Design a protein around this ligand. Sequence first.
Ligand SMILES: *[C@@H]1O[C@H](CO)[C@@H](O[C@@H]2O[C@H](CO)[C@@H](O)[C@H](O)[C@H]2NC(C)=O)[C@H](O)[C@H]1NC(C)=O
Ligand SMILES: *[C@@H]1O[C@H](CO)[C@@H](O[C@@H]2O[C@H](CO)[C@@H](O)[C@H](O)[C@H]2NC(C)=O)[C@H](O)[C@H]1NC(C)=O
Ligand SMILES: *[C@@H]1O[C@H](CO)[C@@H](O[C@@H]2O[C@H](CO)[C@@H](O)[C@H](O)[C@H]2NC(C)=O)[C@H](O)[C@H]1NC(C)=O
Ligand SMILES: *[C@@H]1O[C@H](CO)[C@@H](O[C@@H]2O[C@H](CO)[C@@H](O)[C@H](O)[C@H]2NC(C)=O)[C@H](O)[C@H]1NC(C)=O
Ligand SMILES: *[C@@H]1O[C@H](CO)[C@@H](O)[C@H](O)[C@H]1NC(C)=O
Ligand SMILES: *[C@@H]1O[C@H](CO)[C@@H](O)[C@H](O)[C@H]1NC(C)=O
Ligand SMILES: *[C@@H]1O[C@H](CO)[C@@H](O)[C@H](O)[C@H]1NC(C)=O
Ligand SMILES: *[C@@H]1O[C@H](CO)[C@@H](O)[C@H](O)[C@H]1NC(C)=O
Ligand SMILES: *[C@@H]1O[C@H](CO)[C@@H](O)[C@H](O)[C@H]1NC(C)=O
Ligand SMILES: *[C@@H]1O[C@H](CO)[C@@H](O)[C@H](O)[C@H]1NC(C)=O
Ligand SMILES: *[C@@H]1O[C@H](CO)[C@@H](O)[C@H](O)[C@H]1NC(C)=O
Ligand SMILES: *[C@@H]1O[C@H](CO)[C@@H](O)[C@H](O)[C@H]1NC(C)=O
Ligand SMILES: *[C@@H]1O[C@H](CO)[C@@H](O)[C@H](O)[C@H]1NC(C)=O
Ligand SMILES: *[C@@H]1O[C@H](CO)[C@@H](O)[C@H](O)[C@H]1NC(C)=O
Ligand SMILES: *[C@@H]1O[C@H](CO)[C@@H](O)[C@H](O)[C@H]1NC(C)=O
Ligand SMILES: *[C@@H]1O[C@H](CO)[C@@H](O)[C@H](O)[C@H]1NC(C)=O
Ligand SMILES: *[C@@H]1O[C@H](CO)[C@@H](O)[C@H](O)[C@H]1NC(C)=O
Ligand SMILES: *[C@@H]1O[C@H](CO)[C@@H](O)[C@H](O)[C@H]1NC(C)=O
Lengths: 203, 377, 417, 148
Amino acid sequence: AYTNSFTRGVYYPDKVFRSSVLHSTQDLFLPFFSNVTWFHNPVLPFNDGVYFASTEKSNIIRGWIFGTTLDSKTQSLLIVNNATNVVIKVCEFQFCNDPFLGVNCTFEYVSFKNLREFVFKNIDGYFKIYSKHTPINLVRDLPQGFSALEPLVDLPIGINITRFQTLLAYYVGYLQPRTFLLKYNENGTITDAVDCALDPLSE
Amino acid sequence: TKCTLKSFTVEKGIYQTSNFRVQPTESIVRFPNITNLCPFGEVFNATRFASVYAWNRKRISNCVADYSVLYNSASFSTFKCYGVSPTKLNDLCFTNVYADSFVIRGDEVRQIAPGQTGKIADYNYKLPDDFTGCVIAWNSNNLDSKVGGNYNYLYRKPFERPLQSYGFQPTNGVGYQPYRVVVLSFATVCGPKKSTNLVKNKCVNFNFNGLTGTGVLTESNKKFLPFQQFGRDIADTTDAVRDPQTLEILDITPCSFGGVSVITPGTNTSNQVAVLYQGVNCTEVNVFQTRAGCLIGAEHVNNSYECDIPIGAGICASYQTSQSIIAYTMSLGAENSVAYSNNSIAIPTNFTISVTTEILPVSMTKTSVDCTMYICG
Amino acid sequence: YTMSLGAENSVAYSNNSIAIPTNFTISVTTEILPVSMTKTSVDCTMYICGDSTECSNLLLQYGSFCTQLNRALTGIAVEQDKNTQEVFAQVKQIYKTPPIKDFGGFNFSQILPDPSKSKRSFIEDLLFNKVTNGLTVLPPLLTDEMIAQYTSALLAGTITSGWTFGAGAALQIPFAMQMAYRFNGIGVTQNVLYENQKLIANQFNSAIGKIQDSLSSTASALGKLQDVVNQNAQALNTLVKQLSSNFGAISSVLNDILSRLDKVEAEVQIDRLITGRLQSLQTYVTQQLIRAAEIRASANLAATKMSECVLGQSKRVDFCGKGYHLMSFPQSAPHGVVFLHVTYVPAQEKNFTTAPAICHDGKAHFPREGVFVSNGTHWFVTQRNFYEPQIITTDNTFVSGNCDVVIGIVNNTVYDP
Amino acid sequence: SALGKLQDVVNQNAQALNTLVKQLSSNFGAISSVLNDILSRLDKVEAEVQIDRLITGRLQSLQTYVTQQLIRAAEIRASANLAATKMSECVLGQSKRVDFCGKGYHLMSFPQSAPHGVVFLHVTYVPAQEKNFTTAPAICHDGKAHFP
Ligand SMILES: *[C@@H]1O[C@H](CO)[C@@H](O[C@@H]2O[C@H](CO)[C@@H](O)[C@H](O)[C@H]2NC(C)=O)[C@H](O)[C@H]1NC(C)=O
Ligand SMILES: *[C@@H]1O[C@H](CO)[C@@H](O[C@@H]2O[C@H](CO)[C@@H](O)[C@H](O)[C@H]2NC(C)=O)[C@H](O)[C@H]1NC(C)=O
Ligand SMILES: *[C@@H]1O[C@H](CO)[C@@H](O[C@@H]2O[C@H](CO)[C@@H](O)[C@H](O)[C@H]2NC(C)=O)[C@H](O)[C@H]1NC(C)=O
Ligand SMILES: *[C@@H]1O[C@H](CO)[C@@H](O[C@@H]2O[C@H](CO)[C@@H](O)[C@H](O)[C@H]2NC(C)=O)[C@H](O)[C@H]1NC(C)=O
Ligand SMILES: *[C@@H]1O[C@H](CO)[C@@H](O)[C@H](O)[C@H]1NC(C)=O
Ligand SMILES: *[C@@H]1O[C@H](CO)[C@@H](O)[C@H](O)[C@H]1NC(C)=O
Ligand SMILES: *[C@@H]1O[C@H](CO)[C@@H](O)[C@H](O)[C@H]1NC(C)=O
Ligand SMILES: *[C@@H]1O[C@H](CO)[C@@H](O)[C@H](O)[C@H]1NC(C)=O
Ligand SMILES: *[C@@H]1O[C@H](CO)[C@@H](O)[C@H](O)[C@H]1NC(C)=O
Ligand SMILES: *[C@@H]1O[C@H](CO)[C@@H](O)[C@H](O)[C@H]1NC(C)=O
Ligand SMILES: *[C@@H]1O[C@H](CO)[C@@H](O)[C@H](O)[C@H]1NC(C)=O
Ligand SMILES: *[C@@H]1O[C@H](CO)[C@@H](O)[C@H](O)[C@H]1NC(C)=O
Ligand SMILES: *[C@@H]1O[C@H](CO)[C@@H](O)[C@H](O)[C@H]1NC(C)=O
Ligand SMILES: *[C@@H]1O[C@H](CO)[C@@H](O)[C@H](O)[C@H]1NC(C)=O
Ligand SMILES: *[C@@H]1O[C@H](CO)[C@@H](O)[C@H](O)[C@H]1NC(C)=O
Ligand SMILES: *[C@@H]1O[C@H](CO)[C@@H](O)[C@H](O)[C@H]1NC(C)=O
Ligand SMILES: *[C@@H]1O[C@H](CO)[C@@H](O)[C@H](O)[C@H]1NC(C)=O
Ligand SMILES: *[C@@H]1O[C@H](CO)[C@@H](O)[C@H](O)[C@H]1NC(C)=O
């Protein structure tokens, strides 16, 4: 199944304040009005990095796994929100097809009513996470509107990623190298964007 | 001015002879509060280590390498390097640090050093003479062996396990006395981020988190979002920063600069001159603040005259009477209330035939350049 | 769609028909001219090398380039003061207006100085409101307050003394009588002014009111001046943005190159930044020289307009707005000037039968000034630009030869007074 | 100081030529700016690298000179078109264009040659020695209004 992404999946591209100004930037972004694949789960490609989002009122989605095999051969990311912390590790993990709720190693780290949105990407050996949270009034699709995602995590871990899967009403779409024009307001938040390749008016 | 114009005679005018630029008074460096130091106590302060016949590996990343403290401390009896010296290594970095360590009799430890000779260097605790760092050691007769000797240990590829049973003893000579040693080589495992105090309102050279510049740092009211580090102007230019040790925002203004412009009468008339520091405020440098810049060596005057040498923003200067350069607001001309009324006319009763010269250029010197002969001769 | 060039009009021509305007409208048409760029100078060593000594030493190998650039921009900068002074400083004395305002019913209050404001006029305040790394902007020589004293002097001379303040010392003349000269200067017999003085004053006052409304209703009127401000900002922003470009160097941040590399490799990488930034600065200075030549052509046009069109009464068709030119008033504006061209436009024509000459006693009579017309039953002589029918007389007409030679002559009495 | 325009047109061209000559001494990154140093000291595979720097720099210096001379020639042509317009309207005629032919009511002008230019001696009537008078737009007689 598929749904329309609308104007969602934009994120702060760099750690920089800009105010009351329009900045044109090329980065791996979810294209506007793209087909975001919908799930009610299987292993998925990672490609140029991933937008992921889930509609929630339950906190049943909890984590992710990433790598080439995601099993035994090489170091692979595990990420889990356990309500005490966000827990991260990169071991050569081995498990059943995917662990689920009943409701060697080289690095480690620790830190419907709503939508949780995320972006996962891997550039220059940095695995990056961005996210946002909002209340909503629609269950079956992403709500039409705008809210830029902001960074959480920036791991220098250098792992090769080509597959991922989710641990647990969720949505997946692929980032692509595209120019966007970003509207920073007077307080330096991104408040609107143009996907330049969308249509001739956007160009 | 004579040098700027490549001439010993200078005509009346204003000449941009130099560009003034306020110098950075000092250098500032800022990085976050020190954290995540590498746990070297497991090598330097531990009572034992792996046998010289079977050496053990170590590694670190996402951490601060306290190598300057490791070199300065008395906890090591000696050290030596296959790479750069510890004064450079205290500011070195790698994507991760890699290492190995062992315990033995002190001469058996020496037999496993980078570029050493013995069964340890051959295979049991190996290390190349070209290794990308340094090795260090200390005595261990109080912990690495009993009063009966280290007879439970072993003695002798790189940084890993040519071998036999151990024989170190605390009552023996300095080669047989127990000791512990290690070696290492080379972004995530860097040396510490040495940092200064912060200076506002002076022109300063600065570093914040590895961006650099020169400017006047000032307290500011720009509301950066919690993840944002730097602020930018409309045309890419950095114009604010977050201080990494106390998360307030500093607005950055350029250190004051402008064209030094020498106002002179002709060198026929005088050797006295006045200097306009264009756009500069006199606090940053007789003295007179014009809207065009700080003007030095001219008298401000409350009369007004035709413009002789133009300064800008309505100001002109001239050499005048007992003589000096004066600077004044230019006179646009004498005022005249025309005697208008609904029934008054003025009619000329006489004339002057006036002959006024007008001069127009019409042609340049006709040049031709043989560009093959100019370029290649 | 295929565009239309304008409405079709088959002019009602025939060999004996003339259309003479029975009435006029005074029109006031704004014209807006650029006069000066933003005066600029670049510390090209600070632009190219950012106060790095390692780069500054390499930039010496390029010789006179980072010196003839400063000389070129200094030539442009001094030329902007010349452009501004050629336009406004055409007046020898700062003429000023009397306390009384007995200008025959004409109302200049919206274009004369407002002492509550600098002391710009009301319309000059609308015009000033509608316009909006080693680089330095230098101030103009004349401040906006000095420019407003010149436009005040030009305007106060123009009102109190006509063209006479251009040809010599200003000679006062009543404003109704100055406009009577402006009417003779377009071939309209001056009694047409004095007999219509209230109507002409109301048309002028109302037309000045429409300038305030036009300037309040849209910013797009000042497109020429706002375009000059935009092009200066666009050029400087482009020149600054080009500091971020690599030009094939390993980074555009010069302190990266000096810390990433050994000195031999660093000098090669820095020389790419020097070459690219120097080529970028030569590109900027070349565009500013060509743009300054464009602004100088506009400043020479504005200076020529002020001489012929403010200080005089230009007889050059469409040099001073559409219609026959009466006078114009200068108003200052940011980086430019505005002329309020006052022009006579004829407005309510009647068709008449006409003849080139009239036979009396075999003598062919021609009009001394004006043209013959008939209302259908009677023959009159009339000035060309306003229908005023006068009896045909030996005073209004001159003889030459006899009836036989003239194609299309007609027979009527000529009254001998 | 009257002929500042013509002597400046001479000076601009002299400064442009002298700048273009002095640029022959610039290295542009080569081992020397004397082209015979390079050709005597270096063998072809090295020499051509250094001569490419001198060619690139000297060629960029000519493109700079010729660009500035094209723009300066456009300025001088605008002045020559103005001088030609003055000679047509102002010598060969009597211009009514205010301040086109000197400050005054224009009578005539005489052209005189000057190096790189022309000089016009604009003969103009300037009025003087005015008197104030009472004035009127028109005058009544037998109820009819008379105008001059
Ligand atoms: C000439 O044209 C003007 C308009 O430009 C006429 O003036 C208007 O006359 C009407 C009445 O006929 C009034 O309602 C308007 O208010 C007048 N306008 C102005 C600006 O005064 C004028 O009547 C015409 N004159 C002749 C002789 O035809
Ligand atoms: C000249 O014209 C101005 C308007 O262009 C007249 O001033 C306005 O007068 C009306 C009626 O008194 C007021 O409602 C406006 O507020 C005035 N405007 C300003 C800016 O003052 C002025 O009275 C006229 N003067 C003469 C002598 O006719
Ligand atoms: C053409 O003009 C003449 C003169 O103005 C007009 O003749 C006068 O007409 C009025 C009545 O409209 C009479 O009171 C006068 O006595 C006439 N004067 C003469 C000398 O005849 C004539 O009517 C006009 N014709 C048209 C077609 O407009
Ligand atoms: C103008 O008036 C004259 C008379 O004053 C007209 O001349 C007559 O023309 C007819 C026809 O050619 C002849 O029979 C008469 O002998 C002519 N008389 C004279 C004295 O020459 C003339 O035709 C009229 N012209 C127009 C254009 O109306
Ligand atoms: C992908 O999106 C386009 C509209 O953007 C739509 O026409 C197309 O049918 C979608 N593809 C799928 C598999 O639904
Ligand atoms: C979350 O993970 C940490 C280890 O990362 C563990 O100590 C803690 O008990 C866990 N909490 C919950 C609620 O599972
Ligand atoms: C652990 O690393 C060794 C090599 O150091 C390798 O032989 C072994 O297969 C690895 N095991 C896992 C589970 O990654
Ligand atoms: C990632 O893959 C490349 C080949 O695509 C390989 O050279 C590199 O060593 C791999 N790195 C890791 C950490 O797996
Ligand atoms: C900016 O933030 C302040 C509070 O810090 C708020 O009052 C204001 O409304 C905000 N303005 C915009 C344009 O978001
Ligand atoms: C080792 O122990 C001593 C005890 O005085 C302490 O001062 C030193 O900091 C310790 N060094 C390390 C590397 O833990
Ligand atoms: C750094 O440490 C000082 C105390 O030493 C503390 O006041 C300050 O808040 C700390 N800053 C950060 C960014 O943690
Ligand atoms: C300046 O000196 C020169 C000779 O050196 C002379 O020709 C010139 O007339 C002098 N000018 C003035 C203004 O004194
Ligand atoms: C800067 O110049 C202004 C006048 O232009 C003056 O009032 C002010 O004191 C100067 N700034 C400082 C810090 O002195
Ligand atoms: C010049 O004018 C200022 C006020 O503008 C006054 O303080 C000063 O005393 C005056 N000096 C002279 C010499 O007139
Ligand atoms: C007119 O002026 C001249 C000097 O320009 C003078 O000699 C002559 O006497 C004057 N004539 C009259 C009538 O005033
Ligand atoms: C003049 O008359 C012709 C018809 O004879 C008519 O077509 C034309 O519109 C008229 N023009 C005016 C201004 O009345
Ligand atoms: C005017 O028009 C028609 C056609 O040309 C002609 O019959 C008539 O004679 C002409 N009249 C004159 C005076 O030329
Ligand atoms: C004309 O008369 C006024 C006084 O009514 C006087 O101020 C003015 O100077 C006189 N002008 C001339 C040229 O005589």
